[PDB]
Amino acid sequence: ISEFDSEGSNMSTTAHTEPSWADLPFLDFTDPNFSWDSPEVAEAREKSWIARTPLALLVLRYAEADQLARDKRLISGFRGLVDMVGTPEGPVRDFMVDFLQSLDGADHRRLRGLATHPFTPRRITAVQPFVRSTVEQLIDKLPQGDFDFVQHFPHPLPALVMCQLLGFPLEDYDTVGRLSIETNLGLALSNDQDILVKVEQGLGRMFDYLVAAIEKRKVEPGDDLTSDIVRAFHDGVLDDYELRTLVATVLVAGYETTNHQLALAMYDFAQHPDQWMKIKENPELAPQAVEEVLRWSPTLPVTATRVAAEDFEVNGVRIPTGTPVFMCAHVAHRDPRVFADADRFDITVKREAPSIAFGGGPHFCLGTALARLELTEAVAALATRLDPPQIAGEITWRHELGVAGPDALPLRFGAA
Ligand code: HEM
Ligand SMILES: [Cl-]
Ligand SMILES: [Cl-]
Ligand SMILES: [Cl-]
């Protein structure tokens, strides 16, 4: 998410008025040196189900993280944040107030419903051979030495899969990846006009590409998600503005997260090569391994973000209207109430509880099932075909709040 220039302030005034906030641990997650793995983070979770931060209440335990991701009294956060920050009237404000993640209730159900079908079990099964073949072809052409796993694998896979999903030429995967990244939604709640022009231009370039695809599909429809949403448009169900906004939401949400999560898998296995070898010996372990990567290194350590729509109380805490509530999946994933030996990466444990890397409630990740398919096909093939990864240079991390994202991940597969 974009940091908003709360800087503590609105959370501060509320904190000064709420006795039920008096015993809540404080975590300053916006500090450049903060780590989700610091001892004080675990201590905070042991102390309390919820913490205060400068921007939001932060839910630290698994049960409550799922409860509040689903609670209808917690609506999408983006529209209130835009009002607070004072985002000028324009394309950036438009997208932040109207993209699927910002919508609630009937409009949300309507628009989301137009995009759910490619992610049903039968349509995941339908795309699995493409995913498998794409992964195989990427492994085939990997460099033999030290190389950036992002450029050579974690970028192309989800870029190609998004092109295939949305009916873009596969040869546009590089362009599509760039266009997605440069939407820079992580900066969209900035107060700086120069930063917001950069977001405005990124969004504009994306829509340059998307609206051409949409206009093609209006006359030359195919068997793809763009075309399917276009049919809903021809049927009067949504308008042109909604059409492009919905396609853009899906593209942006589906690309960088998946890219990052693939890179994080490799980083985990570089630390634990013995577990890579277990997958190689028994590649049926890949789904369980993927779930352990999602548990231990979720790419969105903050998953569900919400704001209170009314004053209410949950597990002893009064949450006043307008208070942002963020679900800390990273920390919940180490909740000893749910996970055995939670502070160890171990793909060999068959766990009753899944990761909650995809949020929850009506907004839960639209692409959950496709994300897992991509991660599983990748981990199975990489572990079958290659020696364990080891890091080969500086890993460059995205600075965005709530994101664990290697921009570049130099590695080698095997010491030789
Ligand atoms: C490992 C990869 C991914 C992770 C960890 C992830 C995680 C998330 C999370 C945490 C949310 C918020 C859920 C909530 O508010 O409760 C979300 C929303 C969303 N994601 Fe994903 N995502 C990933 C990949 C994808 C993919 C592959 C797609 C589509 C192809 C996608 C499309 C979306 C969309 C469209 C939303 C908004 C849903 C709505 O507001 O109704 N994401 N994702
Ligand atoms: Cl605990
Ligand atoms: Cl307690
Ligand atoms: Cl467990």
Contact by Cβ (8 Å): 55, 326: yes
Strand partners, 328: none
Task: Report CA(302)–ligand 4 centroid distance (Å).
Answer: 21
- Per DSSP, 104 falls in state -
From CA 224, how far away is CA 76, in angstroms rounded?
28
70 is in an annotated binding site: no
Contact by Cβ (8 Å): 275, 345: yes
From CA 25, how far away is CA 40, in angstroms rounded?
9
Instruction: Sort residue 8 into left (φ over 0), alpha (ψ -120 to 50) or beta.
Output: left
Task: Report CA(45)–ligand 2 centroid distance (Å).
Answer: 5
Q: DSSP 3-state assignment of 9?
A: helix
From CA 82, how far away is CA 85, in angstroms rounded?
5
Output the six-digit token pair for 74: 């917690």
- Parallel, antiparallel, or unpaired for β 57-59 and 74-76? unpaired
Strands (E), 239-378: 305-308, 312-314, 317-319, 324-327
Contact by Cβ (8 Å): 371, 394: no
Phi, psi of 115 (to 5 degrees): -120, 5
Structural domain spans, the chain: 1-416
Contact by Cβ (8 Å): 407, 393: no
From CA 48, how far away is CA 335, in angstroms rounded?
12
Of 179, 155, 172, 153, nearest to 247 (Cα)? 179
Instruction: Kindly tell me the sign of the dihedral angle through the C-alpha atoms of 325, 331, 333, 338.
Output: negative
385 is in an annotated binding site: no
Q: Transcribe 126-141 into DSSP letters.
A: HHHHHHHHHHHHHHHT
Taking CA atoms only, the protein residue closest to ligand 1 atom 35 is: 250
Output the six-digit token pair for 257: 């997260």
From CA 221, how far away is CA 214, in angstroms rounded?
9
Helix pair 225-234, 240-271: axis angle to 10 deg: 160
Strand order in the sheet with 324-327: 50-52, 57-59, 324-327, 305-308, 74-76
| Lookup result for tokens 């909740």 | 335
Residue type, 4: F
From CA 290, how far away is CA 256, in angstroms rounded?
17
Task: Report CA(401)–ligand 4 centroid distance (Å).
Answer: 28
CB atoms within 10 A of CB 402: 23
Q: Is the CB of 302 under 6 A from ligand 1?
A: no
Strand order in the sheet with 389-391: 147-148, 410-413, 389-391
From CA 393, how far away is CA 9, in angstroms rounded?
40
Task: Report CA(65)–ligand 3 centroid distance (Å).
Answer: 15
Q: Is the CB of 306 under 6 A from ligand 1?
A: no
Q: For domain 1-416, which CATH number applies: 1.10.630.10, 2.60.120.10, 1.10.150.110, 3.30.70.20? A: 1.10.630.10
- What is the number of alpha carbons within 13 Å of residue 299 lying toward its C-beta? 26
From CA 59, how far away is CA 71, in angstroms rounded?
13
Altogether, the residues listed in the chain come to a count of 416
Of 24, 35, 39, 28, nearest to 3 (Cα)? 28
Q: Is the CB of 112 under 6 A from ligand 1?
A: yes
Of 38, 32, 25, nearest to 3 (Cα)? 32
From CA 376, how far away is CA 293, in angstroms rounded?
11
Terminal-residue alpha carbon distance, the chain: 40
From CA 359, how far away is CA 338, in angstroms rounded?
17
Contact by Cβ (8 Å): 155, 400: no
Residue type, 224: D
- Parallel, antiparallel, or unpaired for β 57-59 and 50-52? antiparallel
Instruction: Give the rounded distance of the alpha carbon of 248 from its chain centre.
Output: 15
From CA 128, how far away is CA 305, in angstroms rounded?
31
